[PDB]
Amino acid sequence: QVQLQESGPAVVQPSETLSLTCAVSGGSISGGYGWTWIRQAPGKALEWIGNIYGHSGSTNYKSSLKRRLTISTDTSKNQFSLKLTSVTAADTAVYYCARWSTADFDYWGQGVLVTVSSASTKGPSVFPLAPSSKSTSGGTAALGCLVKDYFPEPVTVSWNSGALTSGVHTFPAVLQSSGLYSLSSVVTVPSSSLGTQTYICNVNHKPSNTKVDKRVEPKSCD
Amino acid sequence: DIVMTQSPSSLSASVGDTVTITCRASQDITNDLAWYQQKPGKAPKALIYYASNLESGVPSRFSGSGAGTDFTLTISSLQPEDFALYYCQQHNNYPLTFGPGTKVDIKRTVAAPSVFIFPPSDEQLKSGTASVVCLLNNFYPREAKVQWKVDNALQSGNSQESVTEQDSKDSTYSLSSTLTLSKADYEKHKVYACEVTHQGLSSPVTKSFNRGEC
Numbered sequence: 173q174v175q176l177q178e179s180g181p182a183v184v185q186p187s188e189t190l191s192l193t194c195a196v197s198g199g200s201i202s203g204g205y206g207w208t209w210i211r212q213a214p215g216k217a218l219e220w221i222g223n224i225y226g227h228s229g230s231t232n233y234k235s236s237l238k239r240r241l242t243i244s245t246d247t248s249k250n251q252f253s254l255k256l257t258s259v260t261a262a263d264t265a266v267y268y269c270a271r272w273s274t275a276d277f278d279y280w281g282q283g284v285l286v287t288v289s290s291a292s293t294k295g296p297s298v299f300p301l302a303p304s305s306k307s308t309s310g311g312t313a314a315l316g317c318l319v320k321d322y323f324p325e326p327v328t329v330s331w332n333s334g335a336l337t338s339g340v341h342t343f344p345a346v347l348q349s350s351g352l353y354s355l356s357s358v359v360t361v362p363s364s365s366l367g368t369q370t371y372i373c374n375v376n377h378k379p380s381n382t383k384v385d386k387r388v389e390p391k392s393c394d
Numbered sequence: 395d396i397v398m399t400q401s402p403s404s405l406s407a408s409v410g411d412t413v414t415i416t417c418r419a420s421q422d423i424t425n426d427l428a429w430y431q432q433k434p435g436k437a438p439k440a441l442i443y444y445a446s447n448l449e450s451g452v453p454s455r456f457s458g459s460g461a462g463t464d465f466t467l468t469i470s471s472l473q474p475e476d477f478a479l480y481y482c483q484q485h486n487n488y489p490l491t492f493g494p495g496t497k498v499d500i501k502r503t504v505a506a507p508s509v510f511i512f513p514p515s516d517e518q519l520k521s522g523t524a525s526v527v528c529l530l531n532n533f534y535p536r537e538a539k540v541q542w543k544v545d546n547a548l549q550s551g552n553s554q555e556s557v558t559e560q561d562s563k564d565s566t567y568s569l570s571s572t573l574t575l576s577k578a579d580y581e582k583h584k585v586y587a588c589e590v591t592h593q594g595l596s597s598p599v600t601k602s603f604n605r606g607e608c
Contacts, residue, residue, distance in 0.1 A: 208490075217481070217492050217493065217494045217495060218438070218481060218483075218492040219492075220489065220490040220491065220492075232488055234489060235489070268437055268438075270437075272485075272490075274443075275426070275428060275443035275444050275447070275485065276428040276430075276440040276442075276443040276449060276483075277428075277430075277438070277440055277483075278440055278449065280437040280438060280439070281437060282436075282437060283436075283437050297517075297518070297521070299514075299515040299517055299518045299525070300515050300517075301512040301515070301527055302512070302515070303510070304511075304512070304513070304603060304608075305608050306603075307510055307511075312508070314508070314510040314529055314531060316512070316527075316529070318515070318518075318525055318527060318572075320518075320525065341531070341558055341568045343556040343557070343558060343568070343570050344556050344557075344558070345556075346554045346555075346556050346572075348554070348574075354525075354554075354572070355556065356527060356529075356556070356570045356572070358529055358531070358568075358570070360508075360531060391608060392608075393608035
């Protein structure tokens with residue numbers, strides 16, 4: 173049946189042009205359907221970018237993007253495509269191609285993540301999140317590691333070479349305004365174990381071939 | 395542009411329940427309203443069109459209704475694969491617009507967050523930036539608000555948040571909030587505080603530290 177597949181680059185430098193193509197099979201790109209680009213930015217609702225209609229060639233655009241956007245079809249490859257110029261950090265998102273047919277989007281691509289960043293490959297700095305002396309009063313201590321300023325995804329975090337799994341929460345990474353990623357990994361343990369057990373986070377970032385082990389030391393006032 | 399809103403932001407459900415979620419349009423859109431389901435890492439899938447028509451290949455336990463400005467999606471006899479995000483979408487007029495989404499949750503009893511605050515580490519402070527971190531651990535439901543206050547001045551635009559998926563073994567969420575300042579600005583203030591609003595708290599709770607006091 174009808175299948176859509178996005179392709180395009182994963183990283184676009186700020187102010188460069190983002191280019192994507194959707195290859196359509198099981199149906200002609202010249203059919204009377206609305207070939208549509210939609211995107212979803214981190215933690216945001218789906219946003220309709222625009223469309224081109226296969227048979228008439230009519231293009232509908234989001235007003236704020238109209239000076240930067242061109243949508244088109246290629247009948248020799250049965251494709252449609254998206255070009256968006258002068259790209260900024262607001263343009264980082266998962267991009268979907270989709271087919272509008274009368275009353276819903278009945279076929280969708282898989283999505284392709286596009287990230288706007290001028291960063292090169294870089295391993296993280298790893299900073300301890302030690303429990304404050306005060307914070308241990310209730311009998312549970314929260315400790316962790318802040319893994320900051322790396323690119324691209326992903327990093328892996330384990331605790332004590334994987335012997336510590338209970339109570340571990342590793343948060344999804346967020347892209348900072350700098351174009352570099354940052355995440356935190358935390359674990360709660362008993363307060364009484366802060367003087368006996370050693371707590372080390374092991375961070376691996378394969379794209380930069382970096383392995384960091386960070387000992388997380390309890391704070392002491394006296 | 396037509397603004398779509400959705401209610402609730404998340405809905406607590408158990409397998410076998412019948413649940414209803416709500417969509418509202420800022421103008422009369424008659425019946426040009428569709429509903430979609432999205433699961434983590436996957437593209438959205440159409441469920442309902444023309445407010446009430448079941449899309450092909452979609453289980454009949456999905457139904458919908460409404461005309462004009464208010465619309466409902468109902469799931470009867472909820473199945474495990476139905477815990478997901480749900481979006482409405484108007485097509486009455488260009489600027490096709492979607493709602494913010496409703497997440498259907500695994501129901502559990504309310505759990506207030508445990509709040510912890512971390513000053514920047516010594517090593518980072520040597521680097522030249524400062525990250526203050528506020529952790530909200532093991533709470534439910536998902537809606538939580540974190541505000542940063544530096545010497546009782548409410549911060550804005552210099553923090554980012556991150557939330558886990560619903561925990562597989564106890565059904566809770568956790569959230570980190572990271573306040574980023576330059577070193578020079580961080581060293582101009584004393585009291586760093588995050589304030590947490592959540593349904594399981596009678597009143598917003600504050601966790602703070604004073605710079606240079608252990």
